[PDB]
Symmetry: C3
Subunit: 249 residues, 3 copies
C-alpha cells in the first residue's frame, strides 16, 4: 500500500510509500490516513508516532498532479478532497501521543501540511519546504495557515505562502519551521519513548489548549495537574528515585 | 507636499518616503496623507504588490518630527489628533488588500518601526537599524503596534526593545524575526510576488489576519473561500499553463 | 534566608541562596516569594528587579527532592505546593516593573518556571535549560506551558517538555528561550534603570493584555497612551532635550 502503518512496540511509523510520484497524495490516501491513526491510537504500548517516507528521498511532493488535472472541472471531487484533507490534518495534529515528522527531501504543499500537523520536525540536509497554492490560484486551509503561523509567525508565513518559493533545511531550521537538523529520528525517538506517557499526553493537551486560546489555568487544568500524583507513573518515578535507578514507564 | 508619494508602475506600486533633510521623520500631515495614498493604490486593479521604502535610500524613518513634538508639547489637541492619525495609518497599512513589503536601508525608529511592522514582510539591507524609543521620553507605544511587534518577535524581545529603547542592527533583527530577509534590493522578492495569483495572495492575507485576530478553526466562510478558488479564472489559467508547460499569466 | 531581597535604590535583587541543594525550591521558599515581591513593589524608587543566584552556579535545579519524596503520599502538601508555585509564578510574571533573570548555570523544572516568568533572560556560557516533569510522571502547569509557548512556539515547547532533555545557552538563545547572551546583567540593568518608569510599567501592561488575547486598541488603552502627555516623565523628557542634558526620570 502507498500509505501504511508499522507498529514496533513503543514506536509506530506512518510510512508514505509512493516513490515514483515523489510520495504525492491521492484522494484515497487522504481518506486512509485517519483509519491508520485510529489503529495506532488503539495500541496501549505506543509512545511515539513517526511520519516518514518509506524510501527516504521526497517526504511528500503534495497533490497527485494527474489526479488534480483529471478532476479540474469536477466539483464533487473538489468537495470530497477538501473534506478528506481537512479531516486528516485535524486528526494528525491532535493525535494523543507525541508525533515526529522525519523529512529527508521535498516537503511541498499538502506534504508540508502533514509535517506541520506533527508535534515536531527533523530535517535532513536535502529537505526542502514550500507551500504553493498561490502558483495555481488556490488557497490554503485556515486550519493549516494557523499551524504555520503558530511556528514561524505571520511575516514568514506570508513570505512562504505569497511566493510559493521553496526554502532549504537550514532556512527552515532558522525560522522555526523545523525544530531539529539531523539524518535520523533514532535519538529523539529514544528520548520520547522512555518518558512518562501520562505526562506527554497531558502536556500535549495543555499545549493544544494554549494554541486554541486558553490564557490562564482553570478548574480543569488544575485538576489534571493534581491527578498526576494519584497516577502509576508518579509512583514509578518516586520509587525509582529512592532506589537510584532509572524509572521504567 | 511630496514628502510622501506614490509611484504606480503596473503590477508594482511604491510608497516613497521623501524627506531626507529630516531623516524621513514623519509629521502629522504625512500621517494624514498615508491612508489617502493607500486608497489610491488599492483602487488600481492591476496592482499586485506595494513596496514601502525611502525615496533616497539611507534612513527609512528616524521617527517623530522632533521640532513638531517639542513645539506641541503642551498642546493636548495636537496630541489627540496625532494619536488618531497615526493609529488610522497603521491600521490601514496593516490591512492593505495586497502583499506589502518594507525595504529598510537605514534607521527605522519609533513610528518608522511602526510602519515597517505594519507591512507583511520586511527586507533589511546591511545598514538597517531598528528601535522603539518611547520610554526615553516618558511615552507609551500603541497597543495595536505592541501586538504587531509581539506577533513577530515574542514578548521577551518585544520588552527588551521597548523597555530599553536601544537599537539593534540588521543581523540581530533578522535573528529575532523582526525582519524576514536580508538583502540590498526588493527586486527579486517583488518579482516573485508580482507573478503569483492575486486571488490567492489576497485570500491568504485575509486568512492570516483572521488567525492573528484570534480565529482558531475553519468555519463556513473559510471553507467557502477555499472552495471558491476552483471556480475562479486564476485556477483555470494555472491548470491551462501547467498543461502547456508555460508560466501562468495571472 | 534561602530566598532574600536586596534593595539598592533603582535596582533590587531577588537572590536564591541555597547552594548546597543547587538552589532547589522548598514550599516555604515558594510561599516567601510573593512576600518579597510585595516588599519590592512598595518601593517607589525601584526601576528594575533582577532574579539571580546569590552565589553563581546553578540558577535553580528545580524541586527540593527530599521534600518531594517525603511528601509523595501527602495530599495536603501537594495542594499547598501547587497553590504556592502557581501564585509565585503568576505574581512574578505580572510584577509592575521590568524583571530580568540572570542565568549562570542549570535552570531546571520549577527553576525554568521562575526564569520564564521574568520579562527577559540573560544566559552566561554555562547556562543550561530543561523542563523535566515527564521524567517523573507529572504535568507542567498550564500557566507555565503558556509562558514557554509564548517564547519558543509549540514545536520547541513540546520538544523540551516531552523529552525533558537539557539545552545549552546557545540553543536557548537560538530558539528564543533567552533574549541575550552575556556574563553580567549590569549593562542591561543600567539601560533599564535610566528610562521612564511610567513608560516601562505602561508598556509591560500592554504586552500582558496582548498575551491575554487583546487584539485591538480600546478606550482604556487609548486613554493610557494619551495619559502619558500629562505626566511628569514626559515633561522631564522634553525639558531635558531642550536643555541638552540627560533626562533624570
Amino acid at each position: 500500500m502507498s500509505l501504511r502503518l508499522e507498529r514496533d512496540g513503543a514506536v509506530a511509523r506512518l510510512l508514505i510509500d509512493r516513490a515514483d510520484r515523489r510520495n504525492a497524495f491521492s484522494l484515497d490516501m487522504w481518506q486512509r490516513l485517519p483509519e491508520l491513526l485510529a489503529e495506532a491510537s488503539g495500541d496501549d504500548a505506543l509512545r511515539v508516532l513517526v511520519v516518514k517516507s518509506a524510501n527516504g528521498g521526497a517526504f511528500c511532493a503534495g497533490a497527485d498532479i494527474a489526479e488534480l488535472l483529471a478532476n479540474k472541472d469536477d466539483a464533487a471531487f473538489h468537495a470530497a478532497n477538501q473534506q478528506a484533507i481537512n479531516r486528516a490534518q485535524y486528526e494528525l495534529a491532535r493525535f494523543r501521543l507525541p508525533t515526529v515528522a522525519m523529512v529527508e527531501g521535498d516537503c511541498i504543499g499538502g506534504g508540508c501540511g502533514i509535517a506541520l500537523a506533527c508535534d515536531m520536525r527533523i530535517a535532513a540536509p536535502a529537505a526542502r519546504f514550500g507551500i504553493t497554492p498561490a502558483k495555481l490560484g488556490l488557497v490554503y486551509p485556515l486550519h493549516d495557515v494557523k499551524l504555520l503561523v503558530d511556528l514561524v509567525g505571520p511575516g514568514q508565513a506570508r513570505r512562504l505562502m505569497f511566493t510559493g518559493g521553496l526554502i532549504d533545511a537550514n532556512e527552515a531550521h532558522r525560522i522555526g519551521l523545523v525544530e531539529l537538523l539531523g539524518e535520523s529520528e533514532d535519538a529523539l525517538v529514544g528520548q520520547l519513548a522512555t518518558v512518562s506517557s501520562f505526562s506527554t499526553q497531558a502536556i500535549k493537551s495543555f499545549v493544544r489548549r494554549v494554541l486554541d486560546g486558553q490564557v490562564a489555568d482553570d478548574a480543569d487544568s488544575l485538576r489534571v495537574f493534581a491527578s498526576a500524583f494519584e497516577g502509576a507513573d508518579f509512583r514509578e518515578g518516586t520509587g525509582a528515585f529512592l532506589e537510584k535507578r532509572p524509572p521504567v514507564f
